[PDB]
């Protein structure tokens, strides 16, 4: 991804969650950027109690993942927009997604010298693995590899 | 100021070999006998015609562990 966010939010009535997410989204569109994926997660129990705008500590919070394509200039604006919203407890930001840690160290990349387009195409989920991932995806990966490489040109040279 | 006990009698770790090396005795004895005034010991009478090997050099002078210094060892 170009940018990503993890947004720890207060667990409110659904109409409010939807309004808040519409506000963040519109704040991203106005600033001339895109949303790769807005992923929803449940109301979880974190390891740290968060206080909201009421200064009332919270045991539970709704987690929400943002993945954005912006300019680095106007994500300052979106940053202090998101962090200043009352329904967001915490937001952590990943800017490292284009050059993550495991590449371009003493010619680790075979047949290319730092191809940037490898990790840009990808989403955050495949750059940073989630805990549930097991050896099983090693299977799926390749059925999604081989299959892809079969249909790509034929699909592209159609139009 | 505390120091390791025997530093007074500490050997020179680079050069303590030189004194004992066969070539040195070959040269020294060589110009001693040349005088005419010294009866050559018999080892000299022998290694006179079988001088020792050339390129065996210590590790102290050459600081290489990987150098295989001796044809023997």
């Amino acid at each position: 991804v170009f940018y990503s966010f993890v947004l720890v939010m207060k667990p409110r009535q659904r109409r409010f969650t939807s309004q808040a997410l519409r506000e963040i989204g519109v704040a991203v569109y106005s600033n001339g950027g895109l949303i790769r994926s807005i992923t929803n997660e449940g109301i979880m129990r974190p390891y740290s109690r968060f206080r909201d705008a009421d200064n009332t500590p919270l045991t539970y919070a709704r987690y929400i993942i943002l993945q954005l394509d912006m300019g680095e200039e106007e994500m300052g604006k979106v940053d202090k927009i998101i962090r200043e919203h009352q329904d967001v407890l915490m937001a952590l930001k990943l800017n490292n997604l284009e050059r993550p840690v495991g590449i371009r160290s003493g010619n680790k990349e075979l047949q290319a010298a730092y191809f940037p387009l490898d990790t840009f195409t990808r989403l955050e989920e495949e750059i940073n693995w989630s805990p549930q991932t097991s050896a099983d995806i090693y299977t799926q990966l390749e059925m999604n590899w081989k299959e892809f490489s079969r249909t790509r040109w034929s699909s592209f040279l159609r139009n | 100021y505390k120091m390791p006990k025997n530093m007074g009698v500490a050997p020179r770790f680079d050069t303590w070999n030189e004194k004992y090396e066969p070539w040195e005795h070959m040269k020294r004895m060589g110009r001693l006998v040349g005088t005419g005034f010294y009866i050559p010991p018999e080892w000299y009478n022998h290694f006179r015609m079988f001088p020792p090997i050339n390129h065996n050099f210590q590790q102290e002078k050459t600081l290489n562990p990987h150098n295989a210094s001796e044809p023997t060892q």
Partner: protein
Amino acid sequence: FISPQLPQMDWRNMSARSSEESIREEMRQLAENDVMQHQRVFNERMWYEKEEEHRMKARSPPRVLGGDYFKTRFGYSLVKNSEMTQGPVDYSQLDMWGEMPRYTSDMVFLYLVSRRRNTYAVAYTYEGKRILNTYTAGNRGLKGGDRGFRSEGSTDNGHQVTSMYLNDLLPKLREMRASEGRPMGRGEKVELVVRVMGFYNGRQGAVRAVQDRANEFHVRYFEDITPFPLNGPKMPRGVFK
């Protein structure tokens, strides 16, 4: 055992050994035993494991994929070497709160704080209300105008304090419960969570005075809350620095 055995009368058995069946057999036998043994002398441990496995096991063509096939599968080469279990994975090995305390509206939290020259104990309702005051090594006498500071924060003081506190803790607990209508008449224990702070001598003894109350108090969870200074405000300056 001095029963005369003539070597001529055995001959039939020796002729049995000249047959290539029996020598095929000794060949198989000796080629199975020729692999390098790591056993050396007879070992009790390994014998036990062996026979325990025998008790446990007593209680108990398709085309070969070529090198080219595994040349084309990048995945497989990573599966063979992977640490990650393939199949359904147990959920209890994922969830954050799996290994963690599970509390109850009725629980009492006992705080044993060991300090350098002092030790003390308190108890709290799960809803955070204080039960009895803090019985302290200097609160109980036990400290000043006496033997010395060296022994002030000692083990036995912590024991004196904790054991003096629990004694006074039971009745007030039964009263605070009688107030909401929980009798706890007989054959009940207080479910206790012992939270311990400090890494000082007075800690050891403290918990001992809990353990001898095991017929009254039942400890579910032993968790120590000891502050760790990553960095922070300056501590008081000592003598040297």
